[PDB]
Design a binder for this molecule. Sequence first.
Ligand SMILES: Oc1nc(Cl)c(Cl)cc1Cl
Ligand SMILES: Oc1nc(Cl)c(Cl)cc1Cl
Lengths: 114, 115, 114, 114
Amino acid sequence: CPLMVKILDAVKGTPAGSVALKVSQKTADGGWTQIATGVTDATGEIHNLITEQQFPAGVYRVEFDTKAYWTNQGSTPFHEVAEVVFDAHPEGHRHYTLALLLSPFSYTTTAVVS
Amino acid sequence: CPLMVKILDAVKGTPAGSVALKVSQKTADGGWTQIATGVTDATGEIHNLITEQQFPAGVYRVEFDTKAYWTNQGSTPFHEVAEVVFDAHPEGHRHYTLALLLSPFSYTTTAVVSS
Amino acid sequence: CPLMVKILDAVKGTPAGSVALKVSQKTADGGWTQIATGVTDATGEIHNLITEQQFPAGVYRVEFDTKAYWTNQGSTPFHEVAEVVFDAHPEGHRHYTLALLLSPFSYTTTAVVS
Amino acid sequence: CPLMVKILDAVKGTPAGSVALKVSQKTADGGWTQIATGVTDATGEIHNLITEQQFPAGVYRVEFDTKAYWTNQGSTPFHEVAEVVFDAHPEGHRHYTLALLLSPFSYTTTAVVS
Ligand SMILES: Oc1nc(Cl)c(Cl)cc1Cl
Ligand SMILES: Oc1nc(Cl)c(Cl)cc1Cl
């Protein structure tokens, strides 16, 4: 699994379950095109989010639907979305874990690359 | 000024000076219209980034060129860019401060919103 | 004002008012001596917490009562306290700002040094 | 194990390997008693840091030697140490995971409880 996520809820002290996300690829032209979607399970993770064949070198954007998550928790969020934009396999294939720490008016995006 | 930023560098323990950013406004069709650009000063701020009149209610996107910042600092960063997207309702002298804390492989974005 | 703080609330998107904190100075024998206490105003700051004369070089500890901050809002927090421990002026006098970003189960502590 | 840690390096984008830490239990007299030491493996973790027998309800301190970590990485750090203090099993017994995101001048401490 070349692309993994781990989302934590800083209000409740649990993983953030049922967070919807979208994975897009940047075109040669210059825009975005959506290639996969997923929803986190109760551990804040998504297994088999994409295949290694869907994940060639290039720039990708992962859009986390934090607004819906907080709304479904009964809280008022600030951000309309949380976007993580990165160049993948710039100099050699490897595995990516996007860690995301959520609060209604704040998030922290970190990356663990192996 | 209804929209301020504060950017800090978590490696050096200073504000992040000379960071370029773009402010865009979501249009009715769902695209984006650029409405301002700026570069942080040595305190990590941009004074008078936009006027009250340029900042009506709606969705905005603030795009911070952190890649260039880290490259110039001599570190190889993870993120191509940092984007903060939010719905503004700037009724009643309601001000937004976007705080951003930068690390080469991490950032934290928070907002402070007045009343 | 060599020692300043800026505390923010990541749940509601405001500065964290009425946060009590204590400043202690490490002693030769390894112990801690309290030198100042204070409470953040509504901007999340404390003015005139200590003087330059009270702030010689050495190890300090700033203890933030985050538990009461969350308890008094009716939320349930994780940490008993937030403690920021640092060596001050190890290469000369400076000015120190401790920024603190608070959520019930998380905080981020950063320093701005001049 | 009832107490796990996960330490990430936000400069390199990897787990923080070989971080030393100490676990202490607050005593009735307001002091601290050390109950364990440990050192993270290359995944930023410590397997079996303590046992259930060592973990009655009460306040605990986990002290992470982050200064030595950054010194070895060849960076100049701000904090002397990173300290996490929390009340364990306040409303009954729980399992705890402490997440720590490290930068030379910043850290984020988060908790995942049960
Ligand atoms: O298992 C985990 N992994 C990561 Cl990467 C984080 Cl940030 C937090 C936890 Cl609990
Ligand atoms: O004025 C400010 N200063 C600092 Cl240091 C932070 Cl983190 C946030 C704000 Cl709004």
